Amino acid sequence: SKNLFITGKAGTGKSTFLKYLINELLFDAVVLAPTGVAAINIGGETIHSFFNFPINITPDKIPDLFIYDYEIYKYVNTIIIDEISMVRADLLDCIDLFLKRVKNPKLPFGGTKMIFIGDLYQLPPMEYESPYFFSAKVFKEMDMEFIEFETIYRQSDKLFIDILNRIRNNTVTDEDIKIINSRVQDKIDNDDGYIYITTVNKKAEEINNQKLDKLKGKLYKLNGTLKGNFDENSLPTPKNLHLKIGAQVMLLNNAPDRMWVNGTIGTITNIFPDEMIIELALENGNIVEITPFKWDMIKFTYDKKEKKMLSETIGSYTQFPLKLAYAITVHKSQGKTFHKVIIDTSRHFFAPGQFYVALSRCTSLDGIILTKKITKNSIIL
Ligand SMILES: [Mg+2]
Structure with a gap:
């Protein structure tokens, strides 16, 4: 079988x-x-x-x-x-x-x-x-x-999806090693709208808390509630949620009205904690209203009464489905795409293929920025 x-x-x-x-x-x-x-x-x-x-x-x-x-x-x-x-x-x-x-x-x-x-x-x-x-x-x-x-589909809007599938099999060609450097900027517009992709949670948490600390709005400290037994190493977003107006955040659930998906980027326009509402402006203009969200922690148990496997809920975690989205690691961005991404090579190490996954997380290669050049043998997966 x-x-x-x-x-x-x-x-x-x-x-x-x-x-x-x-x-x-x-x-x-x-x-x-x-x-x-x-x-x-x-x-x-x-x-x-x-x-x-x-x-x-x-x-x-x-x-x-x-x-x-x-x-x-x-x-x-x-x-x-x-x-x-x-x-x-x-x-x-x-x-x-x-x-x-x-x-x-x-x-x-x-x-x-x-x-x-x-x-x-x-x-x-x-x-x-x-x-x-x-x-x-x-x-x-x-x-x-x-x-x-x-x-039958993929997660990129442009036509040269081919470039991702071309460095898959180490067939990244001279003709198409440029344009790949064309995106090597010097970051004149730091940084609005771009999320940095990194390899170490330490430095991603550093860029996030960089941007938050500079925004001159007041600091809001949202606290989620943990019921029962919920592993605090699997919080989608911190129990001490620190947020300000103007913050660039990410959504961590799939909207039922298909208004957003896990990974959508926005900007906080208002924070009202007594009403349990965070307002943010999406990229396409639309302002949304985000209320807290309950995640369930499952443990499979065998029900000897019914002779079937049951998902028994052993804990819950309720917090706003948001986290700071100025930076994220290649690992923590598994099912996300983004539209404006910065891949710095000067900082952050990207072993070829860790670097590929990075590229695999921008809607279009027009919304990409890099730091140093890219050769033909540095893409040897
Ligand atoms: Mg079976």
């Missing part, structure tokens, strides 16, 4: 379709994701919580890993892992190794049927050949179906 890899985009569809899947059709399946935020966005459990993995988990640490509940996995026969590109090679082998301990040890993933959901950009054809998931030892042991389901 083959497993499945599919290439699906983080739309509202995916999230609710997965709920229908594992509630109305499948009763022996769960939905995992690599980080906490990624897990709450789609209503799943993080891989680490589902397996009670310590934070520094590694394949050799597995044989002697303590197991809280040997029984839950006996009832789990299909595992869906979303945002598969954010899973490390060694982590996927830990999952395989783990399943083999609790489930049938002679088969890959203990015999569990595995479904992987990734992005159009991250795709495949004793020591690891790369940190990316397709370099897991367990890919050797098994065969998969490949569905490029959401391949």
Whole structure:
């Protein structure tokens, strides 16, 4: 029974379709994701919580890993892992190794049927050949179906989408190494409307708190409420939300009236905390009214009464779906596009391919700025 890899985009569809899947059709399946935020966005459990993995988990640490509940996995026969590109090679082998301990040890993933959901950009054809998931030892042991389901479109408006797919296979050409330098500015208009892309959370938090500190409006300090058991390492936005008028922010939910999507940029025009309203102006002019938003933290549990897997809500987090959007790391911007992005090379290191993902996060390459030149062998993925 083959497993499945599919290439699906983080739309509202995916999230609710997965709920229908594992509630109305499948009763022996769960939905995992690599980080906490990624897990709450789609209503799943993080891989680490589902397996009670310590934070520094590694394949050799597995044989002697303590197991809280040997029984839950006996009832789990299909595992869906979303945002598969954010899973490390060694982590996927830990999952395989783990399943083999609790489930049938002679088969890959203990015999569990595995479904992987990734992005159009991250795709495949004793020591690891790369940190990316397709370099897991367990890919050797098994065969998969490949569905490029959401391949009928992409996340860029311009015609030279081709350039992204041209440096994919190291075929980045001299003829098209320029224009790629044409975007090398010297940043005369600092910075309005551009989000900086970085590699280190430290320096992204530094640029964010730079811009906020200079804005001369009063400082507002919005406090979200945590109920029950909610991991404070998976807050989509800080519990101490610091904001001012004029702040350049990002939206962290998908509007139901399709007025915005996770990643949309805006500017705060008013803050009214007694009424629990933040007003912001979008890029296309429209002013919106943002009220707080409740995220649910799930833990899968087997209901012995009904003989099906249930998503049991173990906590909640209520805060305004916003965070400072002057800067973000390449990792924390996984499902977002943006329109005005700054990729500084002078600061921030971008190993070729970390640099590619960066480029993969601007609607158009006209809304891009760089610092230094770009050669043909510095794009050798
Ligand atoms: Mg099933």
